Design a protein around this ligand. Structure first.
Ligand code: CL
Ligand code: CL
Lengths: 81, 81
């Protein structure tokens, strides 16, 4: 799942993807960002460890509000805020 | 990690990617195929569990020989011959 000794500044919160995705599929959703761990927190929500805070900020810009289909829209935010 | 009850007929062998990829990055290589598990077998090799034999066959067609950069090209095959 998640590396035990991670820093919260590298973490991304992501929700709204289709519940069918497993943890590998969540990493696939975020290609090409390096993903170091994923914790599933809900039916359609997870926390994802990226490389550093610059990756987190760019991932937020790239994916937040993105429409996946008619019934799914991504909510993406930095864990540390 | 790799589920214990997985069948080798649903599995592919993948090698030649940059050794700096982790298990999540190997799944990202294979987007959008559903990945159910991954076992690292070497510095630049792994075994990946897909959904069924059709996915294994199409993943081989799609990814075998793919050039990632000047020094890296993928070798992809069915685990069982
Ligand atoms: Cl996907
Ligand atoms: Cl949720």
């Amino acid at each position: 799942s998640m590396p035990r000794g991670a820093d919260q500044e590298n973490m991304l919160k992501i929700s709204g993807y289709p519940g069918m995705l497993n943890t590998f599929g969540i990493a696939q959703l975020l290609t090409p960002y390096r993903v170091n761990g994923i914790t599933i927190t809900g039916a359609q929500s997870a926390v994802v460890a990226l490389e550093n805070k610059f990756q987190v900020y760019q991932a937020v810009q790239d994916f937040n509000g993105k429409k996946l289909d008619r019934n799914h829209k991504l909510q993406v935010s930095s864990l540390v805020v």
